[PDB]
Amino acid sequence: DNQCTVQVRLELGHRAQLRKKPTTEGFTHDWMVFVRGPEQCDIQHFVEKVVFWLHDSFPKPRRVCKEPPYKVEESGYAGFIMPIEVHFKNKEEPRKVCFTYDLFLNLEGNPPVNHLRCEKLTFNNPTTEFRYKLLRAGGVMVM
Ligand SMILES: COc1ccc(CNC(=O)N2CCN(c3ccc(C(C)=O)cc3)CC2)cn1
């Protein structure tokens, strides 16, 4: 009857580089973390918001992006593990997915960091409304 699985893809990533000169605060690095879809996909169809949970050392460390670009750009002096929550426009479970993102910086001398983490999300028997949103985003029905 109505069994199906819908797969969508998310790309998490970050860039970091050593500043030519530290900030007055002693911030050595510029970095950027993001969540995006692959080319020609619009994840905003199924994503309500992305929450980036910065290290307690940052002011207002809960950074919300309710629309693209889903990204945080900062200057700092150390990497950390960053919880990233991708909230879905889904009425039922699952409502979100959480990733533990390793935001690492390039130690002196080393080239800039430019990392990508590809995540495939499998939704089993999504609702009609949420299935609509997944497929509008470029999601694929399996079997
Ligand atoms: C102990 O382990 C760790 C691990 C990782 C870090 C990284 N943290 C930073 O790089 N920074 C945190 C502090 N920074 C700010 C401080 C103050 C302001 C205000 C008041 O506007 C803005 C920014 C940004 C850079 C730190 N400690």
Side-chain angles (χ1 to χ4, degrees), residues 2-142:
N2 268 78
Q3 300 297 94
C4 79
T5 287
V6 174
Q7 296 194 302
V8 294
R9 284 179 302 121
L10 292 186
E11 292 175 8
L12 286 68
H14 83 291
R15 304 192 183 111
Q17 76 200 8
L18 200 63
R19 296 188 56 93
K20 274 199 204 75
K21 300 290 191 190
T23 75
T24 56
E25 282 296 318
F27 306 162
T28 49
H29 286 74
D30 299 330
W31 59 250
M32 192 269 294
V33 65
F34 59 88
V35 175
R36 69 178 192 207
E39 299 173 335
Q40 301 195 16
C41 297
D42 191 352
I43 60 167
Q44 182 178 14
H45 285 111
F46 76 83
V47 174
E48 181 206 7
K49 65 196 172 156
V50 175
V51 182
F52 304 87
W53 292 95
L54 269 50
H55 193 264
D56 288 353
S57 57
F58 280 89
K60 295 202 186 168
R62 184 183 189 259
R63 305 297 179 80
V64 189
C65 297
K66 270 155 221 172
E67 72 293 303
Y70 307 108
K71 72 168 189 197
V72 178
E73 296 172 293
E74 279 300 333
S75 286
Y77 56 79
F80 50 95
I81 301 300
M82 181 186 298
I84 302 178
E85 292 173 351
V86 180
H87 295 249
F88 304 135
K89 290 178 175 158
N90 189 10
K91 306 290 183 185
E92 74 167 22
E93 293 191 352
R95 305 287 312 278
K96 67 173 175 201
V97 61
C98 311
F99 308 98
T100 312
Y101 192 84
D102 177 8
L103 191 87
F104 59 89
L105 305 182
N106 54 315
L107 61 80
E108 194 181 9
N110 280 1
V113 173
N114 189 2
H115 268 258
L116 196 72
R117 167 175 168 179
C118 300
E119 296 291 337
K120 177 169 36 189
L121 301 181
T122 300
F123 296 88
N124 292 318
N125 316 300
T127 68
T128 76
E129 266 301 321
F130 191 55
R131 181 186 47 206
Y132 292 0
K133 298 187 193 285
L134 295 167
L135 295 184
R136 278 191 281 261
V140 164
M141 215 188 69
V142 178

